[PDB]
Amino acid sequence: AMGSGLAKYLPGATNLLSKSGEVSLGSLVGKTVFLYFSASWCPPCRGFTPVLAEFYEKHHVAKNFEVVLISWDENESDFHDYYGKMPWLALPFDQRSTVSELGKTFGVESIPTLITINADTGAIIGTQARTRVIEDPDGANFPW
Numbered sequence: 319a320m321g322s323g324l325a326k327y328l329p330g331a332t333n334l335l336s337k338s339g340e341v342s343l344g345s346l347v348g349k350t351v352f353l354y355f356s357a358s359w360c361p362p363c364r365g366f367t368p369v370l371a372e373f374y375e376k377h378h379v380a381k382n383f384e385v386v387l388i389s390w391d392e393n394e395s396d397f398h399d400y401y402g403k404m405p406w407l408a409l410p411f412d413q414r415s416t417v418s419e420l421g422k423t424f425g426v427e428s429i430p431t432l433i434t435i436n437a438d439t440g441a442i443i444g445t446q447a448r449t450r451v452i453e454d455p456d457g458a459n460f461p462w
């Protein structure tokens with residue numbers, strides 16, 4: 319809720335989408351969270367998403383992290399179809415006005431981009447995970 323370190327970034331947001339029910343921001347307590355800025359029509363994103371999905375499947379429990387899609391999709395059908403390819407969570411389509419604001423907050427200058435955040439404190443703990451996933455698809459230097 320308001321306690322979450324993520325709350326400062328997602329002011330008008332309560333829940334995130336998951337593969338089952340919606341989950342509270344408080345459910346991410348204690349986790350490392352990767353904010354994944356992406357879009358369904360972006361070719362580098364389309365190429366990276368399955369790589370990240372493999373990374374998530376292998377490591378998300380062992381290394382206690384979550385991924386949250388922050389989608390640049392303007393079309394709701396595209397948003398749901400593309401998030402449907404992903405195992406992790408998503409900022410709901412109804413919050414999409416905040417996407418450009420979030421990008422500006424973290425200095426996102428292109429996508430795909432991962433921003434690594436401490437969920438509890440909201441501290442930025444990395445901005446280059448999109449690159450580190452390529453070089454180190456196994457666990458070695460967590461959370462970079």
Ligand SMILES: Cc1nc2scc(-c3ccc(F)cc3)c2c(=O)[nH]1
Pocket residue numbers: 357359360361362390421426427428429
């Ligand atoms: C393919 C693609 N799609 C998109 S959708 C939004 C971006 C983008 C561009 C510049 C920025 F400063 C932030 C996001 C972006 C991009 O860089 N590449």
